[PDB]
Design goal:
Two copies of one chain form a homodimer. Chain A is globular and about 45 Å long. In chain A, the strands form two sheets. Chain A has a five-stranded mixed sheet, covered by helices on one side. Chain A has a two-stranded parallel sheet with strand order 6-7. The first copy, chain A, has a single domain, classed as Collagenase (Catalytic Domain) (3-Layer(aba) Sandwich). In chain A, helix 1 packs across helix 2. Chain A is of the alpha/beta class. The structure holds ethyl 5-(1-methyl-1H-imidazol-5-yl)-1H-indole-2-carboxylate (2 copies), calcium ion (CA) (6 copies) and zinc ion (4 copies). Chain B: Monomer. Interacts with TIMP1, TIMP2 and TIMP3. Binds (via the C-terminal region) to collagen.
Amino acid sequence: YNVFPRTLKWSKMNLTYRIVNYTPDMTHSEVEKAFKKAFKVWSDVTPLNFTRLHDGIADIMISFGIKEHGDFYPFDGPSGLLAHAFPPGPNYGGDAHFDDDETWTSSSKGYNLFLVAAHEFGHSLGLDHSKDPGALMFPIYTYTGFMLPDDDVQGIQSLYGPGDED
Amino acid sequence: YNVFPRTLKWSKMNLTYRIVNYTPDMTHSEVEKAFKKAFKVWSDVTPLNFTRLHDGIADIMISFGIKEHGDFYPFDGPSGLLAHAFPPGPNYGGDAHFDDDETWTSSSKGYNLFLVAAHEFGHSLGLDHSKDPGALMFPIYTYTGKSHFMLPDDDVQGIQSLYGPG
Ligand SMILES: CCOC(=O)c1cc2cc(-c3cncn3C)ccc2[nH]1
Ligand SMILES: CCOC(=O)c1cc2cc(-c3cncn3C)ccc2[nH]1
Ligand SMILES: [Ca+2]
Ligand SMILES: [Ca+2]
Ligand SMILES: [Ca+2]
Ligand SMILES: [Ca+2]
Ligand SMILES: [Ca+2]
Ligand SMILES: [Ca+2]
Ligand SMILES: [Zn+2]
Ligand SMILES: [Zn+2]
Ligand SMILES: [Zn+2]
Ligand SMILES: [Zn+2]
């Protein structure tokens, strides 16, 4: 027999993602690089592995949409809500949605896609918002050139462990 | 940091359920008796008690739906997904939905509702799928043709590890 896990987390370490569509704001290449680096933020401190799929059903389906886009969390046009992601689970679980009424960038203008994605993928892996003001999972956007804060390290390792520690 | 905490088990032994609507396939009486019997499977070997409500909010809301039916876990017409249930918790937690594109029966002409409900209520109470091929919680429907149902030992040990013996 099997009881349900104590916390919402993936039960396998090999996860797949798919970029379903792209923002007008950045090249395909810029978006792919941003997401790849965002996943590496988390794989670097756990045993998780992320492989990209070009079609079909992935564990983490990533898309850009506006207003109503197929869930209970409609976006709201420019400004306000920027993105959201669903906790590990069946079907839409793990999926990450970005509001394409925002301006997404590879730089410090608008919202840096890498940084917001890194935050959203935290949710896709089972992290909620943190009260640690320095945490990646703190619910307020900040821009910098990346090292993952310790609060997020402790959080993600509480779920999946550290993977290779060196 | 914060993770998404799972309610492993119900915090209370006395649970309510409500049959929100009914399948065309069976009489109201047949449906009510199947669900009552499905709960009895679990209450017979634990301290859990189940009482039916006819109106308002209940711990376990039971309904029949087709395709997209309000939770963004859509059913798929005849065959495939038969039903799903949410693990213990608030909101949708505990709720059980049956695909009304399936044929439901009190016998063997279709899917026996009692059996599928007994399995689905296992999920409502915090059981995941078993790997024991003889378990009720094994994810493959089977019908024995016997007038009496005996809860397999795997499921008994499973549910009692959560709630203890009656
Ligand atoms: C909806 C708002 O949530 C976010 O998207 C979000 C992005 C983000 C980035 C940083 C950060 C920047 N440089 C270093 N860190 C740790 C810190 C918190 C953050 N939150
Ligand atoms: C696809 C979802 O899984 C189910 O709906 C399901 C129903 C079911 C019934 C029995 C059974 C019948 N007679 C005695 N047992 C133990 C065993 C396993 C089962 N799984
Ligand atoms: Ca917005
Ligand atoms: Ca998904
Ligand atoms: Ca845009
Ligand atoms: Ca179906
Ligand atoms: Ca409920
Ligand atoms: Ca039907
Ligand atoms: Zn969304
Ligand atoms: Zn967030
Ligand atoms: Zn449903
Ligand atoms: Zn099941």
